[PDB]
Amino acid sequence: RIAKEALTFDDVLLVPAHSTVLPNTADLRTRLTKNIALNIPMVSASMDTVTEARLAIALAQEGGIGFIHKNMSIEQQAAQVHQVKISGGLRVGAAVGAAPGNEERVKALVEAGVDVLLIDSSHGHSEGVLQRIRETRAAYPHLEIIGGNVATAEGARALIEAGVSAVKVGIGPGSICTTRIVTGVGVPQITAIADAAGVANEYGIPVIADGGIRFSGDISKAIAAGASCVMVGSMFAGTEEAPGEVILYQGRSYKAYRGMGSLGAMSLVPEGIEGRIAYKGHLKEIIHQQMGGLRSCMGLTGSATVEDLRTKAQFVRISGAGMKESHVHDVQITKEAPNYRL
Amino acid sequence: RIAKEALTFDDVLLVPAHSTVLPNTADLRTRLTKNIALNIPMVSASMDTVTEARLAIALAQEGGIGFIHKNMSIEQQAAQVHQVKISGGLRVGAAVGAAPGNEERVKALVEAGVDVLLIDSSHGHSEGVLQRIRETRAAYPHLEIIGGNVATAEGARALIEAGVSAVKVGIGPGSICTTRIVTGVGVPQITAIADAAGVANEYGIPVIADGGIRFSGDISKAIAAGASCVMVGSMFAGTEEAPGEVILYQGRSYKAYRGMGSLGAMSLVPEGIEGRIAYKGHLKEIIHQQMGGLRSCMGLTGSATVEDLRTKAQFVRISGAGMKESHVHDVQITKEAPNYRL
Amino acid sequence: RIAKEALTFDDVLLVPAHSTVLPNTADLRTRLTKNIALNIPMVSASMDTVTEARLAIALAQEGGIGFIHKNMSIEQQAAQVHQVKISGGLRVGAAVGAAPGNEERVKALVEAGVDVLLIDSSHGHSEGVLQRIRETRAAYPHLEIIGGNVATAEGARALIEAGVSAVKVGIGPGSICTTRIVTGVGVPQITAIADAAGVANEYGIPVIADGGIRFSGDISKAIAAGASCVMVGSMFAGTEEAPGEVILYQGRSYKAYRGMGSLGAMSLVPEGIEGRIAYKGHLKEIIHQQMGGLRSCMGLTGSATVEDLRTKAQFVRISGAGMKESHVHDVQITKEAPNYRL
Amino acid sequence: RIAKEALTFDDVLLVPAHSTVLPNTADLRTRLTKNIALNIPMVSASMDTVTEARLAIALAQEGGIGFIHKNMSIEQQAAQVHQVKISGGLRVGAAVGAAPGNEERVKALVEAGVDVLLIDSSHGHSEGVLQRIRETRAAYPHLEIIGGNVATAEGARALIEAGVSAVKVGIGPGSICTTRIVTGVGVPQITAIADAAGVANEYGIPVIADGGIRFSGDISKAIAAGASCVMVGSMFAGTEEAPGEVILYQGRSYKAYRGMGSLGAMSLVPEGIEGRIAYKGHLKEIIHQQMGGLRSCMGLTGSATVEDLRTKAQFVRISGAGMKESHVHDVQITKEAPNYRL
Ligand SMILES: NC(=O)c1ccc[n+]([C@@H]2O[C@H](COP(=O)([O-])OP(=O)([O-])OC[C@H]3O[C@@H](n4cnc5c(N)[nH+]cnc54)[C@H](O)[C@@H]3O)[C@@H](O)[C@H]2O)c1
Ligand SMILES: NC(=O)c1ccc[n+]([C@@H]2O[C@H](COP(=O)([O-])OP(=O)([O-])OC[C@H]3O[C@@H](n4cnc5c(N)[nH+]cnc54)[C@H](O)[C@@H]3O)[C@@H](O)[C@H]2O)c1
Ligand SMILES: NC(=O)c1ccc[n+]([C@@H]2O[C@H](COP(=O)([O-])OP(=O)([O-])OC[C@H]3O[C@@H](n4cnc5c(N)[nH+]cnc54)[C@H](O)[C@@H]3O)[C@@H](O)[C@H]2O)c1
Ligand SMILES: NC(=O)c1ccc[n+]([C@@H]2O[C@H](COP(=O)([O-])OP(=O)([O-])OC[C@H]3O[C@@H](n4cnc5c(N)[nH+]cnc54)[C@H](O)[C@@H]3O)[C@@H](O)[C@H]2O)c1
Ligand SMILES: O=c1[nH]cnc2c1ncn2[C@@H]1O[C@H](COP(=O)(O)O)[C@@H](O)[C@H]1O
Ligand SMILES: O=c1[nH]cnc2c1ncn2[C@@H]1O[C@H](COP(=O)(O)O)[C@@H](O)[C@H]1O
Ligand SMILES: O=c1[nH]cnc2c1ncn2[C@@H]1O[C@H](COP(=O)(O)O)[C@@H](O)[C@H]1O
Ligand SMILES: O=c1[nH]cnc2c1ncn2[C@@H]1O[C@H](COP(=O)(O)O)[C@@H](O)[C@H]1O
Numbered sequence A, B, C, D: 001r002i003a004k005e006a007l008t009f010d011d012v013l014l015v016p017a018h019s020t021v022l023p024n025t026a027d028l029r030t031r032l033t034k035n036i037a038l039n040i041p042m043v044s045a046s047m048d049t050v051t052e053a054r055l056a057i058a059l060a061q062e063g064g065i066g067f068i069h070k071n072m073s074i075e076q077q078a079a080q081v082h083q084v085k086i087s088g089g090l091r092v093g094a095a096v097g098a099a100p101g102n103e104e105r106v107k108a109l110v111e112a113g114v115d116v117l118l119i120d121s122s123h124g125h126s127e128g129v130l131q132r133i134r135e136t137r138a139a140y141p142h143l144e145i146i147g148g149n150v151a152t153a154e155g156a157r158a159l160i161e162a163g164v165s166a167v168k169v170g171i172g173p174g175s176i177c178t179t180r181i182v183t184g185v186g187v188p189q190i191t192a193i194a195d196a197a198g199v200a201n202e203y204g205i206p207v208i209a210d211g212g213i214r215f216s217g218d219i220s221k222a223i224a225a226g227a228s229c230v231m232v233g234s235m236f237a238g239t240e241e242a243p244g245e246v247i248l249y250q251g252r253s254y255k256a257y258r259g260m261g262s263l264g265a266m267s268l269v270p271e272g273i274e275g276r277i278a279y280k281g282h283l284k285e286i287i288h289q290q291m292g293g294l295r296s297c298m299g300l301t302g303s304a305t306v307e308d309l310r311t312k313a314q315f316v317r318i319s320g321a322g323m324k325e326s327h328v329h330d331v332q333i334t335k336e337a338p339n340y341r342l
């Protein structure tokens, strides 16, 4: 009944190794799905405070892909997909529910030229969800389909066998998620990525690490645990291109950020809250900061490619003291850096 | 892929043992490099807010050695080395980059009478860095050369085999460093010292523990894990002899302290920040405090020599509760001590 | 020798009156000097953290004029003046000292086409300052000269009698100034304006209210008290156009802002300090907000032009309680406004 | 029986005037007594946390005089006076009680060459204090005697009529004093000075403003109100030269500072408390800063000598808002100044 210990980002560090890679020469290309490549390993969450066309365009220009959220009419969703397609033949994705009734939406989104369809659910291992993956595969046998979310070996296998092109991993880790507290269920994200990747590696199916990314080092750790890219919410929330107006509070600027299972979003119990995230300027500058840290990791681990980081890098386990030593400590900071701040 | 647990200072304590050593009779002499001795096991970081000639002189007078930083013209660097040499034939060191183009600088510093040359890099296990160690060895076969930084057995071996006279250990532990967060890579300092020393002990090569020293007890722990001395930044920052003017803020005095990979220092992503450190008066008084604690450790472990502490002392692992018991607890402090303060 | 009570902004409120004026039909034009008009009643402080050519340009574009600070070589200051002169036909000022030896600097600035010359001093009623004004007026009979700073009727009188085209008013009210505290000398800014203006109005010489403006209401009050326009430092510090780079601190953005009598700026005791001011975006937007508050004021007072506000608006004296009532009270602010911020 | 409003420092500001005076040409000389001059207008408080021989010497060197406290044996107090007398030809004072039985102590201090004798009491208008002054004047007709403390014209009158060479002014304004709170008695320090001075000026007897000085502006105001010099306790407490050792607390340095009517000092109810004051360095440097602010004041008021400031400078009454305007406001201080500190 007690399966083992499980670990997340702040429980591990990566081991530096012999390297003939310099940061500016590391190759950040990776896979999102079996047949869709990315130039960087970053995708945006399908959240109404994160991804509509405007953010999807910016992110695609930088080499990632956005997933257009489903809190809008079918017509609006397809129009937003279309807009991204007609902006330079940029790749775009779109989410739909794992609930019956959604066939219309999927059709309109496929007709609109969507590159990758995401069946996002909080329980990718629900039979219901698997069934809707199977029917979607049968109806669209050449559509790249992302399923999840799962946190286990068996959950990944069940998704792969139902027909998905990629497995999405994460139950409960999101900055705004309260699932693990509200229900008591979830698995710490590093362990969850590795167990899922362990299985998915065998079908050549990529794993997307969704949730709980805060610092650029978490991106390196997620990928080294077996993920081919990461999906991020709070890190992109607050950018100029994210949906929503700037709000001024106590001398600062913010945009609204909320879980997709929060009361305001759902519009009988919520598994997310609503909050505010600091305004951060252009997404592009954030991506440069985040990829800067990753490139640097790849230099420190002698990882030439994302694949090298994903399959050959080592970790050590650390304690609470190890983590405090890792952050800045014993000094009063007077000038933060754009990749390290309150 | 998951190598093991790793530990830093606040995860361990040293075991008291039978002793015929009194604090005031302990012998603090040690080695910096294979052929350079120190009277105490302390060296100063090659940082623009820590070591120029003025601090290098004071520290050499107390029995350590300063490493003159490289953020100044070649001419200024050599003049600062010279100044330390003409101040009583005191020992001095100097840092250079591990980047091509630096041959000039090395030459000028050797001509200026530098005792020990430091190739400081954030990734001592980069092929590039090893190559520049090899060329420096070939060009100057009798120059004591320190290389690093590394955090592993294999990293130490690679440095020793490339020609270094000492191995420097530390990736990410520095008070002002954010490498471990920004990249996700690093190893907790105690484990890093021991793995490096494990290998280096065999070539008779000393290990320098660079970073994350906060209290005098960390010096004892670093040495007991296998280091022959420690390199310290924040502990010496703020002294009268450290570079920079005093700044008054909210009733207190400070000097600027910043990482050498911070934006202000580098003048595309930073792996340090900028901060302020409390003014602490004369370096000499700080050294007396810090060596006072070490001497006392050597009495409590029955260590006659640094070598005895480095090779025969024992540790125990402790928890978070163990560490809280170790600090002052349950009492409102009204009079701090100079070796224990906010 | 305790003539009278004296008042500043938070001591008074303006009385709403019969009006046929609307915010948008208010006429904002006014005088900076005897022979220089402005489209809006605002000038920038001659501080090295406020006005260089770039902010001078933006402010001119909007209807104001900037004063190029003197903390720079004569040639640098000249190129700055010329740079604004050639940017779209724009007016510009520059500041010099009343220190003897300033004759060469004055020449360059004049030869660079400067529209107005500020002789700025903390003590305009100083005989030495008066002489440099006489000497300057004799040498350049057609040069608009601003003299100050004064805080009295008799000091106003002395400056005008020496030849100034405008009297600048303010001793120690500045956000960053400590003169009142360190010397015990000065006059609350509304009384100082009215006293100076009583006199200068006899000569048709305009008064410039310099320092202590924080809210748009302060611009209204300063003008209703007698000034023809206001000079501001902190209100424009932190704008993109101001000199200095952005500093990230505790999750917010700032630029440095310091007094010209602070230790940093001096390189006798300092009479200012150094600080940081929230980054505010483009000056344009600050000016729009500020002037919106002044137009609403004019609409509330039946003041059609600046001159009507300056000579016919009435005031009431309030207590600390009236002031508490004037701010927001008894409610937790959740969304602030671009003209009302922490 | 509610004669009048009464004021202290933060109630007033001094009026800038026509000036041919510069800070550096200001003449700081003044009188402590009828027949004792000083080069600067500052004396030290006769407190066991402020003045012993060491601070007396430093203060004399700089142009002031210290009053040796009486919390010590008669012989100890004598050796203290003699110690200052033999240190470079320096003036010195010593304090005694108005308690009967003080005749022997007075003798020793006189025989040790004390230049001035302070009979200090919290109630100079006490008949017992008046008698001890008469008795003392009768016994030592040539001895400069300082009498006080008083807070009125009539109390000033009584002391002079008993034979004092100087009237010391202050009931309860001291940083560490609680007399006003515990007894309900006293007078705001500017009104108290002016009232006392009105009278003493009729006799050419100087007034000493004792207590409540915090900023250099307060020294200006106290002198403009009538005093010929100021007496300070907290402003010199915490200097190296003051008695007591340095206390480290919460990362800063302090010395103890306590009222002479506090429980600690008494070994009837206490009328002071005990506290700590920031360590400030060498007295010399404090005095340089303080007097720099006074010279700047003199330059602002056209006051060439102390006597011009004391008899011709004008004041305005301000509100809490004027006072808020006089300090730094609306900006986060990042570098304070040695004359303007938290
Ligand atoms: N990753 C997470 O931990 C997490 C948790 C909760 C919500 N969310 C997000 O917020 C939104 C909320 O919708 P939702 O309920 O997660 O999915 P959903 O789209 O409302 O439901 C889809 C399917 O999930 C299945 N399911 C089975 N048990 C549960 C359960 N206990 N809780 C939730 N679903 C179950 C069921 O088959 C259902 O039809 C989604 O967009 C998610 O991205 C994420
Ligand atoms: N000890 C640490 O954890 C650490 C980390 C970062 C910076 N620093 C300090 O700050 C300064 C910054 O310069 P730097 O970049 O560390 O060294 P550097 O002197 O700029 O670079 C020297 C060499 O490091 C090699 N390198 C390979 N991968 C990386 C990587 N991912 N990041 C950095 N270097 C790599 C490469 O061969 C390069 O030419 C140095 O003075 C260091 O002392 C220390
Ligand atoms: N407006 C204020 O309240 C205020 C106060 C202090 C400084 N400042 C600013 O800070 C900068 C520093 O210059 P500064 O200190 O004004 O003077 P300054 O620019 O160094 O000197 C100007 C002249 O002021 C005359 N002066 C006579 N007495 C005094 C006195 N007590 N204090 C100052 N000047 C006197 C004297 O003739 C001198 O040559 C300037 O840019 C000022 O605008 C402003
Ligand atoms: N300046 C002040 O406001 C103040 C107030 C309290 C104490 N102190 C200081 O603290 C020390 C303690 O001495 P002390 O308490 O002033 O007096 P003390 O030195 O113990 O006695 C001096 C004399 O004051 C006379 N006196 C009459 N009524 C009172 C009264 N209500 N309170 C005090 N004295 C009275 C009485 O003649 C007595 O002998 C001295 O060094 C004082 O300078 C100063
Ligand atoms: O309401 C919610 N409940 C639980 N998980 C959510 C909710 N909304 C979004 N998520 C998940 O949280 C992720 C973003 O996490 P973040 O990057 O830490 O902010 C999304 O990609 C979703 O998988
Ligand atoms: O910018 C930086 N990034 C990472 N490490 C740094 C940087 N600057 C200095 N260091 C390291 O931090 C050490 C000092 O650490 P400290 O003694 O805890 O302050 C130095 O000796 C360097 O090895
Ligand atoms: O160091 C200083 N001391 C006193 N006044 C200053 C100093 N520096 C600038 N000032 C004045 O303060 C003004 C700006 O005040 P603010 O608009 O309240 O920030 C300037 O126009 C100057 O008159
Ligand atoms: O215990 C006390 N009660 C009342 N006044 C005191 C006491 N101790 C000292 N004083 C007075 O307070 C002065 C110092 O005030 P300060 O300069 O504001 O710290 C001394 O010169 C005494 O006049």
Ligand SMILES: [K+]
Pocket (backbone or CB within 6 Å): A325, A326, A327, A328, A329, B172, B173, B174, B175, B176, B177, B178, B179
């Ligand atoms: K660190």
Ligand SMILES: [K+]
Pocket (backbone or CB within 6 Å): B325, B326, B327, B328, B329
């Ligand atoms: K303990």
Ligand SMILES: [K+]
Pocket (backbone or CB within 6 Å): C325, C326, C327, C328, C329
């Ligand atoms: K209100």
Ligand SMILES: [K+]
Pocket (backbone or CB within 6 Å): C172, C173, C174, C175, C176, C177, C178, C179, D325, D326, D327, D328, D329
């Ligand atoms: K002020």
